[PDB]
Amino acid sequence: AAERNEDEFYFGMMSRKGPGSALTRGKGFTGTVDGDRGNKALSVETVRLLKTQD
RNA sequence: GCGCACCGCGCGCAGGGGGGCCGGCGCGGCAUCUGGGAAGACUCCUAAGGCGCAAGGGAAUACCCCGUGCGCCGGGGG
């Protein structure tokens, strides 16, 4: 954290959401980067399929 | 009709059959009036925007709140 480069660029930054700050995260601030549970916003046709099943 | 005063009524109670059919309650209609809901698509349809589903974040942690992907309607213009 001391010897980091402020103008650094990685291409995972275009596909990840950073740790933020206490002001952009607020009470839900830990110092970490969130990960993916594999959940997704599912479209309306396939939810119609899943609710005919239900 | 028994017990209580065999110098008395009435009383504690078992309950027959009908009565005053007095009022409440129950059920049935009730031309209207009253209230609520539904309601006509000219009407009302919450606004120039809203709604739904699925994910994401936060909690008064039963409720609720905020703005990503899919859709559904709408206003305006046309």
UniProtKB/Swiss-Prot annotation:
<protein>
    <recommendedName>
        <fullName>U3 small nucleolar RNA-associated protein 11</fullName>
    </recommendedName>
</protein>
<comment type="function">
    <text>Involved in nucleolar processing of pre-18S ribosomal RNA.</text>
</comment>
<comment type="subunit">
    <text>Component of the ribosomal small subunit (SSU) processome composed of at least 40 protein subunits and snoRNA U3. Interacts with snoRNA U3.</text>
</comment>
<comment type="similarity">
    <text>Belongs to the UTP11 family.</text>
</comment>
